[model samples]
Target: YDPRGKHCYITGGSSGLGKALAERLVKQGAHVTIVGRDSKKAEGVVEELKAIAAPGQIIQCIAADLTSPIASTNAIHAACKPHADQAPDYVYLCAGFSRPKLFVETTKQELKDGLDGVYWVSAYTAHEACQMMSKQRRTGKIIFVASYSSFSPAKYALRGLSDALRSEMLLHNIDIHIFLPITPDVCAAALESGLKKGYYQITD
Candidate 1:
């Protein structure tokens, strides 16, 4: 998205797809703040992101889990909140995990735990980000990363959240992006293209 010098906030930015996106953005000369749970590991990721950061680019890791609204708010507050000048141009919700098991092998408690991690994580964080961005009266985009798979039930549920936000956020002048990855350029390169085109559905 020719995001040169623009601000960005990403969850689960310590590794995997999130880390790849962070790297790609930094390479494009964008200011990026990444949120992750493991403080120690995140510090290591911060160093790596910094090493490849373009001149004057902001690249750092914030330690916080997305499950709690308080944590999400605090993380967003720290990254970009209140002041419209600091408003993040892009917010990517990518914090989630998959628990694969046969129906007979899954328990009710397991289902609860899985939903909390996969579904609630994005919900809480996206909730906070939308509030802050809209309150600031700034134009931005919120990208939801979900997977399309038969066994990945909660992943598909994210589309419902995305659709709802699309309706709610359009009035705020905020674009909603749903990135449904069904690769490991790390896949970030593809999303970069999608975002530039302002495509609602980003695929890889």
Candidate 2:
């Protein structure tokens, strides 16, 4: 429950839900690595997180464009490298976006980009993180951020991906949690409290 000395890595952590979760962990004495596409932005978030961190807590930033498979893989390694001896205890994949449009109006390229952003990025990151954790024979938690849109055609891939990972990751001692956070802060708080209370799946 208390994450003191534990390592946590979060994607899309420059702002919004990711930022909130980083802050929550730092307050609980966790070592946090917040990742985003903008190095400057990620650094800015690190500063804010440091201001709220518990005594002796660690907070860091990593910049990677998650939409690229190679970039995502590199970022995952970068996130865990600092704590190689201690694999990340929690890996949160929250980097994504949505641009809703009528199916007729959606371009093939646009749909591809959306899928890369909302699904492939998280998939690659989760896969890499889980491999690291499993190699270390460590027990870890992997949280995927989904939304109500996930129930709709626009974001349905994310829902199916999360479900598949849930079933496949069971034997790896890597618990998978998917949450639909209606609001940033509300979702962050729910996740924090639920994690403390040992909930595997959380919905808001």
Give per-model TM-scores.
0.90, 0.90
Pairs with steric clashes in candidate 1: none
The ten-residue window of minimal lDDT in model 1 covers 79-88
Q: How close is candidate 2 to the true structure, as a TM-score?
A: 0.90
Put down candidate 2 lDDT per residue, 7-120, tens digits, no spaces: 888998887899888877787678999989888888988987788776676688888888777887788777666776577888888887776667677778876777777887
Q: Evaluate residue 94 in candidate 1 and report its C-alpha lDDT on the 0 to 100 scale.
A: 82
- Report the lDDT tens digits of candidate 1 across residue range 1-204: 557787888898887888888887787788888888999888898888888875667776789878787887788788754334477888888888875776667777877778778887888888877787678777878888886222376777889899988888888888998887625445787788788887898887
Query: How many clashes would you count in candidate 2?
Result: 0
lDDT of 2: 0.78
lDDT per model vs. reference: 0.79, 0.78
User: Each model's number of backbone clashes?
Assistant: 0, 0
Question: What's the lDDT for candidate 1?
Answer: 0.79
